[PDB]
Chain A
Amino acid sequence: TGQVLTQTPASVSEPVEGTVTIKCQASQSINNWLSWYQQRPGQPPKLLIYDASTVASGVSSRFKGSGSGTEFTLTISDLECADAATYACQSYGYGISITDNSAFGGGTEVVVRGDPVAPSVLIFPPAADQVATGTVTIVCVANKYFPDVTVTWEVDGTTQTTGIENSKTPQNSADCTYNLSSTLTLTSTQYNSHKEYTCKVTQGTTSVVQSFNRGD
């Protein structure tokens, strides 16, 4: 029969020194056969809890796994900045139940709330080599900030809506801070018409505006 694994919540936000609760429920009952994995971006997943209660060697005691039957929970106590990662549960079966109950969790996103830091906003005008190609993009970055921000692009006072891309760095394992890069892609014909290009980064009530003028 088809075994389905439900993992909740999808995203959780808890401050430093706090606690995180992740719920993993199995459609079919499993006799305490569960595993918890930590997967950092661009990193091999690490096994922390196996048999739903046993801490893997080398894993800190702050990770505790509990549960049996069809419902399990994972608790992270004394939350740290390095704990900000993606977590998932694996339901494995043995003997007769091989492949009968074998599924992976949906995955949960853990963000660690730290002391807020204002974003230092930097803007880079397009290079000389870029305009010759016919497609021009402008890079604006916000460094060492928390929490998340919203980026606004304005040309000669008019807000742009099309051709904006944002890439956000994962939280730093030391101070729980973000880094964002905003790219506004246009055409060389469009770029040679307007003069005032503005990148605005808003952190709640705080807004940091960085602008530049073409030909200066």
Chain B
Amino acid sequence: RNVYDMKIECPHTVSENSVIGYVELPPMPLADTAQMVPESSCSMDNHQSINTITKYTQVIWRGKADPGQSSQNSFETVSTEVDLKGTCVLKHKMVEESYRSRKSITCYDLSCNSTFCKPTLYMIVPIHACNMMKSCLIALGPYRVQVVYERTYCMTGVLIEGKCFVPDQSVVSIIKHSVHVVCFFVAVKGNTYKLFEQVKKSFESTCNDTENKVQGYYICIVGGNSAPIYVPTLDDFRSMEAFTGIFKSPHGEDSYSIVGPANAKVPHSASSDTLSLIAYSGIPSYSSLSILTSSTDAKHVFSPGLFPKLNHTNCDKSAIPLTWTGMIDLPGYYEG
């Protein structure tokens, strides 16, 4: 029982746009998250690729098994291959195809310590469901979420402190005279997806030999409702601001006790340690999902009870978040 709310805001007037909502769920046992997939009953069928199997690397920490050294409260790390379904691992052009196919994208992000997990369920639907506003029920493990459609008193804008807001910055904005954003990492090989070639340019980070590093972009939805924005793109300074916020605060925006640091092997078959993490104890916090930077092929990382190194000063033993939520400042004006 005790159903939880998934708020989604819809404008009166519609302008290739999708809306997104999120909800943070209470902690659940880690063992029960295996084979956990969202089961939706909406009129829009969930995308079949989300429920597919994505192979993750499970990195866990435990006190040292060896007696004598265990008396010195030392801990070791174990890397293993696991199969995770329903996680927010989007593919190239999946959002647009879902938009044109009237299909929803329902996935969840996991925030886990060594034993318990806090899931954050996400749903991306086209605005085509904002007129019918048919209520839906989604089941994810022992939790229930209410799909609630809210009609804001804005034609095309987003409500901020009781006022509407439309970000243009275009010539239209000139004539007329903090926004929440959620991002997902999509891995795709190519030549125009040199993510870290732009990271080295944007921030003073000693990252040489970027060719062998991870390739991909970040797709973000600003203000709940907006057209898909790729990150980074050099001709959208809004996307550039999203990029900066992603790499200035990789852990996100807004207890737990930090245990010693550790290193681990992200493929679980590597010759040497390839990732730096911070193990911790306490209530689950931050994101347990990340992607190894030093590998062209996306090496997804699941580290319950550990904090991946997101500082990126040295590109060795580095990682980037799978999902990112925060606030970025963009120019614009309110209606009226």
Instruction: Check A-B contact in the complex, CB < 8 A.
Output: yes
Chain A CB within 8 A of B139 CB: no
A57 touches B66 (CB 8 A): yes
Provide the residues of chain A in CB contact with B78, threshold 8 Å: 94-95
Chain A CB within 8 A of B80 CB: yes
A57 touches B115 (CB 8 A): no
Provide the residues of chain B in CB contact with A58, threshold 8 Å: 67-68
B82 touches A96 (CB 8 A): yes
Chain A residues 17-61 with CB under 8 Å of chain B are 31, 35, 47, 50-51, 54, 56-58
Q: Which of A47, A98, A100 has a CB less than 8 Å from the CB of B65?
A: A47
A94 touches B62 (CB 8 A): yes
C-alpha gap A31/B33 in the complex (Å):
20
B67 touches A95 (CB 8 A): no
Given A94-B62, A94-B78, A95-B82, verify A100-B31 contact (CB < 8 Å).
yes
Chain A CB within 8 A of B220 CB: no
Chain B CB within 8 A of A99 CB: yes
Interface residues on B, range: 10 to 19
Give the shortest distance, in Å, between B325 (CB) and chain A (any CB).
Answer: 25
A47 touches B67 (CB 8 A): yes
Q: Which of A31, A57, A96, A100 has a CB less than 8 Å from the CB of B67?
A: A57
B66 touches A94 (CB 8 A): no
B115 touches A96 (CB 8 A): no
C-alpha gap A47/B70 in the complex (Å):
13
Chain A CB within 8 A of B60 CB: yes
Give the shortest distance, in Å, between A112 (CB) and chain B (any CB).
Answer: 25
Residue of A nearest to B81 (CB): A31
Give the shortest distance, in Å, between B187 (CB) and chain A (any CB).
Answer: 23
C-alpha gap A125/B122 in the complex (Å):
85
A56 touches B66 (CB 8 A): yes
A50 touches B65 (CB 8 A): yes
Give the shortest distance, in Å, between A90 (CB) and chain B (any CB).
Answer: 11
Q: Which of B58, B62, B68 has a CB less than 8 Å from the CB of A57?
A: B68
Provide the residues of chain B in CB contact with A50, threshold 8 Å: 65-66
Chain A CB within 8 A of B137 CB: no
Give the shortest distance, in Å, between A128 (CB) and chain B (any CB).
Answer: 52
Residue of A nearest to B83 (CB): A96
B67 touches A56 (CB 8 A): yes
B67 touches A94 (CB 8 A): no
How many of A's residues come within 8 Å of B, CB to CB?
A: 16
B65 touches A96 (CB 8 A): no
B30 touches A98 (CB 8 A): yes
Residue of B nearest to A99 (CB): B31
Summarize B's interface: helix, strand, loop or mixed: mixed
A57 touches B69 (CB 8 A): yes
C-alpha gap A54/B76 in the complex (Å):
14
Provide the residues of chain B in CB contact with A100, threshold 8 Å: 31
B66 touches A96 (CB 8 A): no
Chain B residues 38-96 with CB under 8 Å of chain A are 58, 60, 62, 65-69, 78, 80-82
C-alpha gap A145/B31 in the complex (Å):
53
Provide the residues of chain B in CB contact with A47, threshold 8 Å: 65, 67
Chain A residues 55-110 with CB under 8 Å of chain B are 56-58, 94-100
Q: Most chain-A Cβ atoms within 10 A of its Cβ — which of B34, B66, B304?
A: B66
Give the shortest distance, in Å, between B55 (CB) and chain A (any CB).
Answer: 13
Provide the residues of chain B in CB contact with A96, threshold 8 Å: 30-31, 33-34, 58, 82
A94 touches B65 (CB 8 A): no
C-alpha gap A98/B114 in the complex (Å):
10
C-alpha gap A160/B34 in the complex (Å):
63
Given A31-B80, A100-B31, verify A95-B65 contact (CB < 8 Å).
no
C-alpha gap A100/B115 in the complex (Å):
13
Give the shortest distance, in Å, between A37 (CB) and chain B (any CB).
Answer: 12
A51 touches B115 (CB 8 A): no
B69 touches A95 (CB 8 A): no
Interface string of A99-132 (1 = CB under 8 A from B): 1100000000000000000000000000000000
Interface string of A183-204 (1 = CB under 8 A from B): 0000000000000000000000
Give the shortest distance, in Å, between A10 (CB) and chain B (any CB).
Answer: 27
Residue of B nearest to A55 (CB): B66
Give the shortest distance, in Å, between A39 (CB) and chain B (any CB).
Answer: 15
Interface string of B87-121 (1 = CB under 8 A from A): 00000000000000000000000000001000000
Provide the residues of chain A in CB contact with B304, threshold 8 Å: 95
Question: Can you add 7 more A-B contacts, CB < 8 Å, to A50-B66, A96-B82, A98-B31?
Answer: A31-B81, A50-B65, A57-B69, A95-B58, A95-B304, A96-B33, A99-B31
Would you mind naming 10 contact pairs between A and B with Cβ atoms under 8 Å apart? A31-B80, A54-B65, A57-B68, A94-B58, A94-B80, A95-B78, A96-B33, A98-B30, A99-B31, A100-B31
Closest 8 CB pairs of A and B: A50-B65, A95-B60, A95-B58, A96-B34, A94-B60, A57-B66, A57-B68, A98-B31
